[PDB]
From Swiss-Prot:
It comes from Thermotoga maritima (strain ATCC 43589 / DSM 3109 / JCM 10099 / NBRC 100826 / MSB8). This is Quinolinate synthase. Its EC number is 2.5.1.72. [4Fe-4S] cluster binds at C86, C173, C259. Its main location: cytoplasm.
Length: 303
C-alpha cells in the first residue's frame, strides 16, 4: 500500500517535474523498477549524455552521480542521500598520487571509477572494471600506477602482462571478499552452474570461477552461454537485474553481499528528492574541467 503510494507518487512527480531516473545495478529492486535506466556507471554516464532532458535523479553513490555531472555540466543532477559514497575509495588521496608520480614519472596514473572526483583531476586516465584491461592494454607504457583497488589492479596485470603499481597500500572492496569455499560448496550443490565473479574479488575466488567480469559484463554472459544456472559473486542488486533480463534462467548469489552505501537510497528519500528537488550534485567548475580530461581519454582508448 505505502510502496504503491510511494511508487505512484514518484512516477507522478518524475513526469510532472521533467526528471529522468538513472539507477545503478546495486540499487534495491524497488528503485531499479522505478528507474528509466538501470546500468553500470559507464552505461549510465553515456546514457546521460544522450538525454534531451536537463534533469536527472541519480540512484547510486556520489562518485557515480559526479561522473554523470562532469560529463553533463549543464544538467541538474540530484541524489536522495548526499552521504552515499565509497569509503574505501576515499583512502586514495592527492598526496599518495603525487608521491607515486614522482617515483615512477613514466607510469601513467590509471584511476578506477570509484576514486573521488578530486582524485580524478590528478589521473591520466579513468577506467571501470568493464574496460580496465582494454584501457591499460592500449596505453604506450608497460608500467602503470593503478588505484584505488588492488585486486582489480592485479587482475589487470594478469591479463595485460604489464606492471601495475597499486595505490594505496592494501586498497580492497569488502563487498567482494567472498570465501573461496563458497565456490567449492556451490559446485557440488549445482554441478552444472556457471560461476561468474567480479574482478574486485580476491585471486583465489577469481581463479575458481568460470567467468570474471564486471556487472555490465555479467549481464552479457547469458547472451552467449546457454546454461540454466549462474552463480553470481557480486553485490546482491545484480541478482534482480539479471533475473529481470533473463527470466528463463536461474541466478544464485555466491554469498549475500550488500553495499551499505548503495542501500542508503530508499523509496522514501527518493520521493523526498523529487518533492524538494534536492540534493543537487555540484562540483567546482575547475574540478569538472580537470576531471573531464582523463575521462575523455578513457573513451578515446575504448571507442
Ligand atoms: O562500473 C560500475 O558501475 C561499478 C561496478 C561494476 O561492476 O559495474 N562495480 C563496482 C563499482 S564501485 C562500480
Ligand atoms: Fe565502494
Ligand atoms: Fe564499489
Ligand atoms: Fe567494490
Ligand atoms: Fe559498494
Ligand atoms: S562502491
Ligand atoms: S569498490
Ligand atoms: S562495489
Ligand atoms: S562497497
Amino acid at each position: 500500500h505505502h510502496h504503491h503510494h510511494m511508487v505512484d507518487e514518484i512516477l507522478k512527480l518524475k513526469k510532472e517535474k521533467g526528471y529522468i531516473i538513472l539507477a545503478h545495478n546495486f540499487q534495491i529492486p524497488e528503485l531499479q523498477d522505478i528507474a528509466d535506466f538501470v546500468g553500470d556507471s559507464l552505461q549510465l554516464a553515456r546514457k546521460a549524455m544522450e538525454l534531451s532532458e536537463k534533469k536527472i535523479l541519480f540512484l547510486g553513490v556520489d562518485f557515480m552521480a559526479e561522473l554523470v555531472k562532469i560529463l553533463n555540466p549543464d544538467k541538474k543532477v540530484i541524489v536522495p542521500d548526499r552521504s552515499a559514497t565509497c569509503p574505501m575509495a576515499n583512502r586514495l588521496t592527492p598526496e599518495i598520487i603525487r608521491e607515486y608520480r614522482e617515483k615512477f614519472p613514466d607510469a601513467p596514473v590509471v584511476l578506477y571509477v570509484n576514486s573521488t572526483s578530486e582524485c580524478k583531476t590528478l589521473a591520466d586516465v579513468i577506467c571501470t572494471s568493464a574496460n580496465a584491461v582494454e584501457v591499460v592494454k592500449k596505453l604506450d607504457s608497460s608500467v602503470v600506477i593503478f588505484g584505488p583497488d588492488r585486486n582489480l589492479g592485479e587482475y589487470v596485470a594478469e591479463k595485460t602482462g604489464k606492471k601495475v603499481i597499486t595505490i594505496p597500500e592494501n586498497g580492497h572492496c569488502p563487498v567482494h571478499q567472498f570465501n573461496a569455499e563458497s565456490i567449492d560448496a556451490v559446485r557440488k550443490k549445482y554441478p552444472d552452474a556457471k560461476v561468474i565473479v567480479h574482478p574486485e574479488c580476491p585471486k583465489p575466488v577469481r581463479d575458481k570461477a568460470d567467468y570474471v567480469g564486471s556487472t555490465g559484463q555479467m549481464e552479457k554472459i547469458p547472451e552467449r552461454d546457454p546454461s540454466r544456472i549462474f552463480v553470481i559473486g557480486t553485490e546482491i542488486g545484480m541478482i534482480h537485474k539479471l533475473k529481470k533480463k533473463f527470466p528463463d534462467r536461474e541466478f544464485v548469489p555466491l554469498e549475500m553481499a550488500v553495499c551499505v552505501n548503495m542501500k542508503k537510497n530508499t523509496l522514501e528519500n527518493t520521493l523526498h528528492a523529487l518533492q524538494t528537488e534536492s540534493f543537487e550534485v555540484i562540483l567546482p567548475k575547475e574540478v569538472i574541467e580537470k576531471a573531464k580530461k582523463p575521462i575523455l581519454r578513457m573513451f578515446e582508448l575504448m571507442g
